[PDB]
Every structure is written in structure tokens, then in C-alpha cells.
């Protein structure tokens, strides 16, 4: 069971996107769709570097989005994280 759980973790990580939770099938319509989604669009490293960038930046210079996210994180609410939706889902009709 322990080995199966490790294998299931790896399979879930290769087939699911960690942030939005959408399936890789919805992204793999284009070649390397899931890889592009996990590298360019939703990336854990990018989110961590975003947090570092907001920590390092001065309050007065935050943009609108940066100030929104900063207040959201100060009050410890995680609505800004995409939940089941992405850019493609948001603009599906216009983009495609």
C-alpha cells in the first residue's frame, strides 16, 4: 500500500495540474499542452517567486493586482488561487 501510494502520487502529479486541478486531457488538445500549462501558465516555482517578489517590493509601488494579492495574503484568504478554471476556460469562446 505504501508503494502504491507513492506510485499514485507520481501518477496524479503527472496527470493533474496541482494549482487549478484541471485534467491534462483538457490541455493536451494541442501538442505538449499539459507541459505548457504546467510550465508557462501554472507553475509552483512561479508562484513562489511571485510571493518573494511581493515580499521584496515596496508597498507604495504595488500595482492593482499586486495590492489585491497582498491584502488577500495578509488576511490569509486563498480565493485568488485559480480553482478549476484557467485562462483558456475563462476566454474559451473568444480564444477558440
Amino acid at each position: 500500500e505504501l508503494r502504491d501510494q507513492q506510485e499514485q502520487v507520481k501518477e496524479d502529479m503527472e496527470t493533474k495540474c496541482f494549482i487549478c486541478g484541471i485534467g491534462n486531457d483538457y490541455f493536451d488538445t494541442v501538442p505538449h499542452g499539459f507541459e505548457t500549462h504546467t510550465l508557462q501558465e501554472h507553475n509552483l516555482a512561479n508562484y513562489l517567486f511571485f510571493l518573494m517578489y511581493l515580499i521584496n517590493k515596496d508597498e507604495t509601488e504595488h500595482t492593482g493586482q499586486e495590492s489585491y494579492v497582498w491584502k488577500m495574503y495578509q488576511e490569509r484568504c486563498w480565493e485568488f488561487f485559480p480553482a478549476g478554471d484557467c485562462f483558456r476556460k475563462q476566454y474559451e469562446d473568444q480564444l477558440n
Binding site: 513562489l48 518573494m52 495574503y73
Partner: protein, 135 residues
């Protein structure tokens, strides 16, 4: 869109952060609460940021077997190429041009037998090189 520092990229690529990310991904996927997934991710982000800032302070204030195998191939195949380079096969073939089907078939077989002996010499040389490597 924002700016990512090259130093931040290097400290992310440092092995310690890689191990920490292994542990965090395993923990979250195996047992991390779905309602607490984002909370745990933000906590791990803060911990990793502090680990990066600590790693910065701390930091700034086989092939020989492939070599042997290639040499074994080169030497053992050049050994067979020496047979053609001697150029004395022409005098022997002067005799074969006038003799019969059985002997031409015999030479046909002899060629492949010589190839197989070349392969045996090659594999023996590979083994010997491996003994020298391990010793």
C-alpha cells in the same frame, strides 16, 4: 507578470530546496487536506523563501569504461582490417578465381568464421579491460 531573480532561480535549483519540494509534494498529495491545500502551499512557500535566504548567506559571504570499450572496438576491428591491409589476399584469390563451387562456398564460410573470431577477441578484450578497471 513579474520579475524573477537569477539568484532566486539558482537557489531554487539548489539540491536542498529540491529535497524539500520532494517532501512537501509527497506530503500534500498523500495526505494534504483539500481545503487546506492552498494554506499548506503558502506555508511551504514561506518556508522555502526563508531556506533560500539562508542558503544565500551560507554559500556567499563509467566514462573510463566507455573509453575502454571504444578502444577495444577500434583495436579488435583494425585487427581484422589488417587482413585486408596486408594486400596478400590477392595472390590467394588468384587461385580461387579458377577453382570450383565447393571451394568458393568454403571461402564464403571462412569469411564469417573470421568475423565471429573477431567478435570473440573483442568480447575477451572487453572483459580484460573490465578486470583492469575493477582492479
Amino acid at each position: 507578470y513579474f520579475e524573477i531573480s537569477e539568484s532566486s532561480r539558482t537557489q531554487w535549483e539548489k539540491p536542498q530546496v529540491k529535497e524539500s519540494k520532494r517532501q512537501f509534494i509527497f506530503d500534500v498529495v498523500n495526505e494534504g487536506g483539500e481545503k487546506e491545500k492552498m494554506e499548506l502551499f503558502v506555508n511551504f512557500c514561506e518556508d522555502t523563501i526563508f531556506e533560500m535566504q539562508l542558503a544565500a548567506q551560507i554559500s556567499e559571504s563509467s566514462i573510463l569504461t566507455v573509453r575502454s570499450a571504444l578502444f577495444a572496438l577500434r583495436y579488435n576491428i583494425l585487427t581484422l582490417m589488417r587482413m585486408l591491409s596486408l594486400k596478400s589476399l590477392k595472390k590467394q584469390m588468384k587461385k580461387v578465381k579458377k577453382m570450383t563451387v565447393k571451394d568458393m562456398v568454403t571461402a564464403f564460410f571462412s569469411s564469417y568464421w573470421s568475423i565471429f573470431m573477431t567478435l570473440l577477441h573483442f568480447v575477451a578484450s572487453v572483459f580484460r579491460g573490465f578486470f583492469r578497471i575493477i582492479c
